[PDB]
């Protein structure tokens, strides 16, 4: 009952951290790769995704 409290919170953080590697429709999950490869009229479409 106590190892499950530790496991269910290290699971929900390591699911939260792995959401950063998802594209969500945008062209790249790295936010510093949209800013260095797109123009500010177009980049604000990708960052809003």
């Amino acid at each position: 009952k106590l190892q499950d409290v530790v496991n269910q919170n290290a699971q929900a953080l390591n699911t939260l951290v792995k959401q950063l590697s998802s594209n969500f429709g945008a062209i790249s999950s790295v936010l510093n790769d949209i800013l260095s490869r797109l123009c500010p009229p177009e980049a604000e479409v990708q960052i809003d995704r």
Partner: protein, 264 residues
């Protein structure tokens, strides 16, 4: 009264460490854009450009281009951003058919002989050739993405100087390869010295970011360039001039809580 969490401490970066491979060869765009005879659309040329320095600002400032359409790069940052392989697709078509050359368009130039991927990264560069290719110039004929197609489906053009929508347009499509790899083609931006153990604003090969470059024991393999984290951010890079391995620890941060009694 109580402890209140307000802001975030973040160490600001001291300087900017720009880093690029120390190659000085200039990329032969002049052999592409100022070539004598362009090949036709059914046999478009695919010239590999590699291991040089690509000044895209010369190609952006010249007024000799009709349309200069970049679909994924927004060409102002082509000088800073730097690639692995750049592929120039040179062919001459009818004047109205340049509009069909786009990621997403369908047509008898799009479907038949020259198809673009819908996830295309690069620039479509088109201009006219009324002064040189117009004659009855009959050498230009037409018939998967990037598929060179070597009653007949082979139909030839007729180009004359009397013909706007039928004038022969010279279009060159630059294709960009953004694969995380040892980069070869990189634009004219000077590299600075490297400073370790200091919160700097690095730029390795087109990868921006802010971190503390330290020394590592992460033995990369001689084909490997980037080391990544769980969350897709880059954890370790390889210095593209002196091939050593550098950690990227982000600069020191933390929450700031303001312990106060009441203002009463």
């Amino acid at each position: 009264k109580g402890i209140y969490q307000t802001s975030n401490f973040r160490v600001q970066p001291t300087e900017s460490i720009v880093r690029f491979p120390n190659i000085t060869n200039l990329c032969p765009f002049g052999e592409v854009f100022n070539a004598t005879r362009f090949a036709s659309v059914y046999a478009w040329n695919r010239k590999r450009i590699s291991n040089c320095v690509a000044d895209y600002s010369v190609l952006y400032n010249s007024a000799s281009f009709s349309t200069f359409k970049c679909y994924g790069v927004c060409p102002t940052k082509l000088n800073d951003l730097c690639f692995t392989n750049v592929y120039a697709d040179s062919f001459v078509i009818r004047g109205d058919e340049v509009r069909q050359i786009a990621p997403g368009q369908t047509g008898k130039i799009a479907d038949y002989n020259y198809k673009l991927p819908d996830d295309f990264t690069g620039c479509v560069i088109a201009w006219n050739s009324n002064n040189l290719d117009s004659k009855g110039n009959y050498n230009y004929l037409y018939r998967k993405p990037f598929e060179r197609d070597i009653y007949f489906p082979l139909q030839s053009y007729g180009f004359q100087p009397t013909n706007v929508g039928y004038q022969p347009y010279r279009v060159v499509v630059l294709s960009f390869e953004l694969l995380h790899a040892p980069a070869t083609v990189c634009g004219p931006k000077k590299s600075t010295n490297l400073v370790k153990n200091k919160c700097v604003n690095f730029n390795f090969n087109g990868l921006t970011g802010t971190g503390v470059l330290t020394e590592s024991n992460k033995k990369f393999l001689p084909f490997q360039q980037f080391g990544r984290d769980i969350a897709d951010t880059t954890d370790a890079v390889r210095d593209p001039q002196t091939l050593e391995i550098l950690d990227i620890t982000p600069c020191s941060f933390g929450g700031v809580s303001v312990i106060t009694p009441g203002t009463n």
